[PDB]
Amino acid sequence: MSFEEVVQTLASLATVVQQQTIASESLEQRITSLENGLKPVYDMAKTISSLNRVCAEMVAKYDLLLEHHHHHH
Amino acid sequence: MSFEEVVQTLASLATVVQQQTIASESLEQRITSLENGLKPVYDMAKTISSLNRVCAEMVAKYDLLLEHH
Amino acid sequence: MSFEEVVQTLASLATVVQQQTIASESLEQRITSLENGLKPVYDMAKTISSLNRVCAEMVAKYDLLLEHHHHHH
Amino acid sequence: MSFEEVVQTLASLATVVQQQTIASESLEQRITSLENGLKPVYDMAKTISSLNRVCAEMVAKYDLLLEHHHHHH
Amino acid sequence: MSFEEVVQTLASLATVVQQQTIASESLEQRITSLENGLKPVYDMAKTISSLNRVCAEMVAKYDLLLEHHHHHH
Amino acid sequence: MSFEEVVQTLASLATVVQQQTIASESLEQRITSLENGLKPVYDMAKTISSLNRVCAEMVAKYDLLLE
């Protein structure tokens, strides 16, 4: 290798390593964003329990008809 | 108040009573069909206890893994 | 078995039969109304069965999220 | 027809008419029960409104993922 | 550039590159974790759409019960 | 560091940099794939507006029929 090629190559490598850094950080931003977007979905449990209680309440309104069904079917 | 009139009234009244039997039987069958339509009510009601169970299990798991850990 | 007896009993029956026509028209109106009214009621019970299935589906899918939190946190 | 056969007839019609009154009262009880069974379902509005709130709460958990979607595609 | 300046730049470039590797391995791990976590999250979004349709169906069926009330009461 | 060691180091780093460009295109595509998965979420969210409205209309109608 000539000293010229060592210099050109080292200069071309630095321009790439520079671009990789900018690309990384940007990627890291999108990753963090997605991670953070996921977090609130862990608290779905409470809303699912509310859905269950709504379901149970809807069913309960049919108690009298269900009793009629038990006697006539 | 003629005997003739009483006989004719009885026969006419008999027809009317038969007409009422027919009409009443149709009303019965209409109510029966309405009662037959309670089936989805029964099928609906049958699903709630299983749902209450899987939800209770979810709540426990959420409690253990997220409320504390 | 007197003629006055036959006539009075026939007049009695006549009015009872007339009464029943009236009672039957009333039940017929009430049945028509129930046919109209119970149609959406029964239809809704079908939608409530769907709601219950969708709720259980939510629960099972959210369970996978819980397994992820257990497995990755 | 004879006077004998009138009492025969008149008596026989009273049994049918009597029987019809019983069948009709039995039917009236079934109608009443179905009418009473329908009533509680009128109150489903409040519960459907609760379901709507649940739906909106569930959607709201995805606000941050949805923000990410907006900025990226 | 002199020879001593080429070695300055090289040892300086190696340190960002060795850092970048460690950073990218960490980013890789975080994306892998997201790939697992977002599976049930996206899946639940589909169930929530179903839920929303079910709610709209409940409202439309119940509307007919409200129409029944309006006409018969 | 001799001239030879500077050359060997350069080629050593050139290889490491090559593998990092490759890995970054990979990590880029995985993220982009996850992001495309946000459509079902966008689709879910666009429906809530209509749903609130028809429910509000139902509630109002119910209240009117009570009054």
From Swiss-Prot, chain F:
The UniProt annotation puts the region (Homooligomerization) at: 3-65
Query: Where found, per UniProt?
Result: Virion; Host cytoplasm
**Function summary:** Plays an essential role in viral RNA synthesis and also a role in suppressing innate immune signaling. Acts as a polymerase cofactor in the RNA polymerase transcription and replication complexes. Serves as nucleoprotein/NP monomer chaperone prior to the formation of the large oligomeric RNA-bound complexes. Regulates RNA synthesis by modulating NP-RNA interactions and interacting with DYNLL1. VP35-NP interaction controls the switch between RNA-bound NP and free NP and thus the switch between genome replication and genome packaging into the nucleocapsid.
Q: What is known of its domains?
A: The interferon inhibitory domain (IID) binds dsRNA.
Its subunit composition reads: Homodimer. Homooligomer; via the coiled coil domain. Interacts with nucleoprotein NP and polymerase L; VP35 bridges L and NP and allows the formation of the polymerase complex. Also interacts with VP30; this interaction is regulated by VP30 phosphorylation. Interacts with host IKBKE and TBK1; the interactions lead to inhibition of cellular antiviral response by blocking necessary interactions of IKBKE and TBK1 with their substrate IRF3.
Q: Which family does it belong to?
A: Belongs to the filoviridae polymerase cofactor VP35 family.
- This protein is called Polymerase cofactor VP35
Task: State the organism named in the record.
Answer: Zaire ebolavirus (strain Mayinga-76)
Residue numbers of the full-length protein present here: 82 to 145 of 340
